[PDB]
């Protein structure tokens, strides 16, 4: 992210974003008493591409024909749209914990309503609770260009 201070018109840049949206806590101008009131510069800030894909345990693998257990997988950059629904895929990447961001005091939104953990400056009296998600770096599926000038270069 990159921001401009409405109080003094300074600029802050390279502002890393956690799971929540995050403005700067302090203005970079030592003339300025500001700690809030920031605007995003949409030219200078930089956006990744992102996609959530929801996946489940394979219908041949489920040990007794019980309910299919699911997982939320996050795809980024080039890896987006590389899969399709009903397909079978292998993903590799990190397992991550995603916080329930409404409880984490997200700019301009109300908390929602199992027991979390508490006693943190950003929570005050609230609980923070956690989903498991996967953040996939590589994706592969396991489940017409009609010109000879492309096809004969496509083959080895």
């Amino acid at each position: 992210a990159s921001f401009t201070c409405d109080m003094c018109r300074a600029i802050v840049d390279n502002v890393e974003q956690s799971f929540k949206y995050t403005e700067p806590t302090f203005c970079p101008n030592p003339s300025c008493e500001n700690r809030a009131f920031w605007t995003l510069n949409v030219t200078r800030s930089r956006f990744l591409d992102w996609q959530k894909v929801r996946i489940q345990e394979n219908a041949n693998e489920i040990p007794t024909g019980s309910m299919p257990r699911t997982l939320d997988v996050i795809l980024r950059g080039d890896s987006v749209e590389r899969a399709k629904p009903g397909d079978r895929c292998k993903f590799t990447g990190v397992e991550i914990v995603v916080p329930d961001v409404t409880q984490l005091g997200l700019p301009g939104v109300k908390p929602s309503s199992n027991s979390g953990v508490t006693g943190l400056r950003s929570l005050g009296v609230r609980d923070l609770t956690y989903k498991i998600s996967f953040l996939a770096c590589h994706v592969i599926s396991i489940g017409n260009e009609r010109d000879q000038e492309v096809f004969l270069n496509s083959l080895s």
Binding site: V98, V109, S133
Partner: peptide, 13 residues
């Protein structure tokens, strides 16, 4: 920005 995306999706989206 809008908070409902950032709330339900859990990323700065």
């Amino acid at each position: 920005y809008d908070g409902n995306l950032n709330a339900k999706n859990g990323f700065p989206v």
